[PDB]
Write an enzyme that holds these catalytic residues in place. Structure first.
Site, PDB file in Angstrom:
ATOM      1  CG  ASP A  35      -0.527  -7.534  -1.696  1.00  0.00           C
ATOM      2  OD1 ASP A  35      -1.168  -6.654  -2.092  1.00  0.00           O
ATOM      3  OD2 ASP A  35       0.134  -7.890  -0.681  1.00  0.00           O
TER       4      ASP A  35
ATOM      5  CG  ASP B 172       1.289  -4.638   0.910  1.00  0.00           C
ATOM      6  OD1 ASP B 172       1.305  -5.136  -0.142  1.00  0.00           O
ATOM      7  OD2 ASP B 172       0.245  -3.831   1.314  1.00  0.00           O
TER       8      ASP B 172
END
Ligand SMILES: C[C@@H](NC(=O)c1cc(C(=O)OC[C@@](N)(CO)Cc2ccccc2)cc(N(C)S(C)(=O)=O)c1)c1ccc(F)cc1
Length: 379
Positions: A38, A222
């Site tokens: 992430d 992201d």
């Protein structure tokens, strides 16, 4: 053409659309867990207690090297949230760099709508900067620890292969993961991996909005967010243009809102009726930009089939956001993304594994002339 980073290739997996994860082994003796890659956050956190959606978890009492920081941590995201205890322990990535570092680890003991049933990951590896680390920027992110304790170059790159696997090259770049050239965009500020979008086109047609709207609040990359999330106004204009560009077939309004799914007979999805989408990013030279273009195969995501039936169901994966643009898997699955922290820039190139057809392909092209790009950023 060759590859000294070969052992890191194909080190990522995914349970088809629920997150790309990498194996990380923490503690002593070894405790291996599947960790979500992430780039939108900065905490390394792992489930540390039983959970319905967790097959395994971190057991601190079995790790002789675990050190309690005697401090709790709470982290809420746009989607989901968790609470845990801070500590440190030895951490390695089997199919990553050949090093072991003492890193901060948040042991997750409680959570709500964070873990995903069937995703097969039990933790999260926040690859972003210290500014957005919780409780505060003094909790050194995993990658900062990696760079400070080892000689691993301050850079990592991601190849997320959609449909689920991919590669996370740590400390370098592997040429077999992309074709064409790499184009770089400046990391505007070191907190989230913030970038600047200067122009948007649907099938070559300019959306025609002040570029300030595209990064209103901010625009970030992201890998832990599924869709291409756009500020409200941009989303609305984008949806109208996409609808007009695919008028050969009508879809209910809810389809464009992600509330309804459309299914086609296996292998019949009319990819051709949907337009390609191009985002132009600030370049590395004054008044120079470049653009990345995705296909419907990227923004129309498959929904875990009923039971391997003859029906391919899809969800429109472009949605709205109230916190700026978020370039998630929808964007990344079409490219090899280089997070060049050392040189404060992010590079994009066509992915060797992006899903495409015989007529169109994802693309990264440039250079283009674009004035006033500096004004596009929100202050
Ligand atoms: C793992 C999973 N992520 C999500 O399903 C997710 C997370 C966040 C989100 O807010 O994430 C913030 C976070 N990424 C910041 O770092 C942390 C996070 C990670 C996993 C689960 C929930 C939150 C927002 C949204 N959206 C609202 S959406 C529908 O995409 O518009 C979805 C995912 C990532 C990559 C893929 F290829 C498929 C599935």
């Amino acid at each position: 053409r060759r590859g000294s980073f070969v052992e890191m290739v194909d080190n990522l997996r995914g349970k088809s659309g629920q997150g790309y994860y990498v194996e990380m082994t923490v503690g002593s003796p070894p405790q291996t867990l599947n960790i979500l890659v992430d780039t939108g956050s900065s905490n390394f956190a792992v489930g540390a207690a039983p959970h319905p959606f967790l097959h395994r978890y971190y057991q601190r009492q079995l790790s002789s090297t675990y050190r309690d920081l005697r401090k709790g941590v709470y982290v809420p995201y746009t989607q989901g949230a968790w609470a845990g205890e801070l500590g440190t322990d030895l951490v390695s990535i089997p199919h990553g760099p050949n090093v072991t570092v003492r890193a901060n680890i948040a042991a997750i003991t409680e959570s709500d709508k964070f873990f995903i049933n069937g995703s097969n990951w039990e933790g999260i590896l926040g690859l972003a900067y210290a500014e957005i680390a919780r409780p505060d920027d003094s909790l050194e992110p995993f990658f900062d620890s990696l760079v400070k304790q080892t000689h691993v170059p301050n850079l990592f790159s991601l190849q997320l292969c959609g449909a689920v696997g991919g590669s996370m090259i740590i400390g370098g770049i592997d040429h077999s993961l992309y074709t064409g050239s790499l184009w770089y965009t400046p990391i505007r500020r070191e907190w989230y991996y913030e970038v600047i979008i200067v122009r948007v086109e649907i099938n070559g047609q300019d959306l025609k909005m002040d570029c300030k709207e595209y990064n209103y609040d901010k625009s970030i990359v992201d890998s832990g967010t599924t869709n291409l999330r756009l500020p409200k106004k941009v989303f609305e204009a984008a949806v109208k243009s996409i609808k007009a560009a695919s008028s050969t077939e009508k879809f209910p309004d809810g389809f464009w809102l992600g509330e309804q799914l459309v299914c086609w007979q296996a292998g019949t999805t009319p990819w051709n009726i949907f337009p390609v989408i191009s985002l132009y990013l600030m370049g590395e030279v004054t008044n120079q930009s470049f653009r990345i273009t995705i296909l419907p195969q990227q923004y129309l995501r498959p929904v875990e089939d009923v039971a391997t039936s003859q029906d391919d169901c899809y969800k429109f994966a472009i949605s709205q956001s109230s916190t700026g643009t978020v370039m998630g898997a929808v964007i990344m699955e079409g490219f090899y993304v280089v997070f060049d922290r050392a040189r404060k820039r992010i590079g994009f190139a066509v992915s060797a594994c992006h899903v495409h057809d015989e007529f169109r392909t994802a693309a990264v092209e440039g250079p283009f002339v674009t004035l006033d790009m500096e004004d596009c950023g929100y202050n």
